[PDB]
């Protein structure tokens, strides 16, 4: 496939995932 | 839009277990009822020695509770606490059933299985599977014995439907309409095809199938966008590949519609098979078609994926 | 770069509903105008009894407001509050039209507007575009005046709309009608009859999602170029490898490295070549490596484009 | 469910390095033992001059500590600090082994060792496993005693290792040696020769990634079943549609609905069927729909499986 | 591991613009130098009237600064502020060059440059590399001295650039010119005419994305090995299954398990084998299982490499 998985359910600069 | 209070009667102090809050009394007066809105439900928490409001509860969650008074109708949960604790904090002050519902939005044994209907359900699942098997087997070249099982399955289906009496009922009706129809060959082929809809009766018994249905209902727009992108790509690349090969003798593609299928099996990376009789320009067009197909499939699908993931975790 | 104040005249206290802030007046006087910059707009909130500034508002959002004075020009939204509260909070103090505008970037004539019962014009235009596409595809069929009349009616409608209207939309509008007027070596004829397909892009003015796709392409041109570069590198490398794996065998499947290019593509994008038997063991190993590397090089750059498309779609 | 105390005995103040906390003594007395639960372990931190509890440690993580007393048994780490700081934060107050253990779930025998003399045994074992796999795949060749000796040496080594050792690893080891002893209807012979391939799974004992894959499969059995169910639904539906599209045309490509199943599969997974010419326009439309729906149905459940694999992989490292 | 101070000399108060911090002087005594470590660099901030330390700076970021003293060696940026502001905060107090450096890791000779006269040299090198690749591809054509002159001009330019310049870049530059001088058993000839393709890797010096890809591969070599291992296991298993499905059938499509190996691959990667008719029902079932397992075993390892590439690409810009 090409999606290879999720996009992270949100990708913003200084996102809460990276916080 | 919500209304915020403006300064200039007397200001009161709130002590949430050491976190001191000071607000105008008019701000607390804005919302009637509620623990802090009226003096009747808050006089117990008064401290005569300190003239302070003492609320020995979670400190970080009082900011949102006060902000509801501050914003005069806007209640948003800050990202510092789980949702479980916030639901408990809001219930303490009794903000109001209508206010809590905003964040909420943020015989007959067949539906409710209770011991004995836990079997009826398994019999229904077995009968649905048996009907599917009979359908597939009777389509075989090697093949009354199938008709008897089919009519037994239909009798069970209609018995369940008539005892029961959205979309489940519609599917149940559709699963038995073609059998009663049999009691231009294009119509016959169409009804024999729509006989396959009995496979969707597993939605009543499969939790994942209902999740998929809800995901489709939620992301109809994204599905339409994906179909539109695919259609545009197919038209463009089929036209390009047809015009890249029209000038050669014994052209592989007779017309642009004849190339449509090819375009599809190149955008979805299914593959067409034989590809030799197409020249260099056709090969370049095919490479571009493959790349654009990967992009146009990877673009909108993750939104539907996200919707399905959310619905799956909400169910469990 | 921004400048911050340094200590050594008098300090003042700011009470944001119980959250006391103490800052040097030199910091407060750094920015002229504004609610806190000048004494005229902040004397109203002064408390003569306690010599304190009272601002009965959202406590957690004042940290960014003070930090803007602290950093002397840097205003960043902390990740603790929704966007709605921050936008309203900054408007309360009137930080400045330029300051708020800078933060915004951190995150007849009836045709263009589909209002005043002009949606009928839009649906007629969409129907004409679809009819033109269908007529083009059907006239490419081998089975075929009747098509020319419909095509020229569509061209008259398109040119009437373009002339009454008078960016990329206008360029597409012009290109959609150039080839018809051109026809009033055969390679140029083939090119113009191919570029006639650009009428499919006329749906951009009416389809919101296709504009999102165009904006995503504009934003991720760099990633698209990187993906094309990676695909070219992989195709060249694996085509050379597979061709040299068959050099020593008679009746070679691939006559030359360029001949293998197409094959590499359908292995890099996992589309499929079809017949694969006359390839030896070394060619099969090279093909497996090509498939894996193509999967890798396709999966590497597509998430960026997917994220851009998702961001644009959910911002729209 | 947890119980929270309600107000009306004496109130005390807690000073976490300047961050003042005020809490009723009844809330503090709810939990016995612990640094703050009993006067024995908290009188040392008393300040006679100010009548205050002084705790010169991390300010932001004390909110969860007090909330544990506030909720009377509910302890969750707020998302403002790393896990390392919060893990050591609890150990200071000694809330209890059971409380800490509950939070943990919120986020000869010379062979099973890593000694210098044990790595050689491991490398010999993995070499023997690889040699057995190679011998299998070579003895299946058309061109072919020499293989039997190598196979019996590998079997002897496997039995010796199993006997020295004496879940699922032992089951795999048993299966890897059963067929050789079995040889000492042709369908049974074919089945045993097929199950001989399970020797490849013995690499799980020596491969860290393979155990991660096994744990991921065990965790996501439900998602795997959902994916299989969706595939089955799609295959049945699209095979039936494509068969009935060619019902009215002579020389039908698909003789029956089951015959089309394979086709449906290699269209849902985008593998590809190959020749497609004798199929009419309706069959092509059904095939396009099948390809799109297969892409969607294979894309839907795999995020959960890959997230589980990511979680297990990062937990291992 | 870090050491935390314990209570029982004098306590001091820190007023970070209204946020009062109270800590033991021993905690401030733990780290020498620094603005707060020694009286010399902090006396200016003392307030004689209030006996307090006043720092008119950011309030939310002082918690990490105090925790460095609190934890005695641990500095973690709390997730409430961007890295830009926190980088300036640590510089204000001058925690120490070693402390700041440790946190950094937590998150003529004109040819190797970019000036007005170096740009033309770079564009010339890129053009020469592209020309060499084109000459290679066209000299492999069946329709064909004229190519040798262009080849030797490219080689002279390559060796001139290498000599002027004088890791991995120099290795690639060397390998790009070894085969030309080698020419001055046909297996070695085939190997050298194959390794001539390495000239295409010289574009790394001029392409920023290619270096990002190389860094991603270096970082995720472990994940690449895991993916290769999973593919090998799946190929062996499914080749064995599909071969033994046709073992008892006459006119078997697959002669041996290695013969089926290729098939397995083009089913795990969903490339497609092509003709599939002569395979029976059991072979088709095995093929469907192989397709599903290949989808799974490809979707599992790739996202880690995807994350590494995204991180490197966004760190570059
Ligand atoms: K594919
Ligand atoms: K394929």
Topology:
The structure holds 5 chains of a larger assembly.
Chain A: no helix or strand
One potassium ion sits between chains B (269-271) and C (270-272).
PDB class: membrane protein
Keywords: voltage-gated potassium channel, membrane protein
Entry title: AcA-EI-shaker with free peptide conformation B
Describe the structure.
Chains D, E: It comes from Drosophila melanogaster. Chains D, E: Belongs to the potassium channel family. A (Shaker) (TC 1.A.1.2) subfamily. Shaker sub-subfamily. Chains D, E: This is Potassium voltage-gated channel protein Shaker. Chains D, E: Residues 244-257, 278-284 are extracellular. Chains D, E: Residues 208-221 are annotated as: S4-S5 linker. The structure holds 5 chains of a larger assembly. Chain A has 19 residues and is largely without helices or strands. Helix content of chain A is 0%, strand content 0%. Chain A is elongated, with a radius of gyration of 10 Å. Chains in contact: A-B, A-C, A-D, A-E, B-C, B-D, B-E, C-D, C-E, D-E. The interface between C and E is large, with 60 and 59 residues. One potassium ion sits between chains B (269-271) and C (270-272).
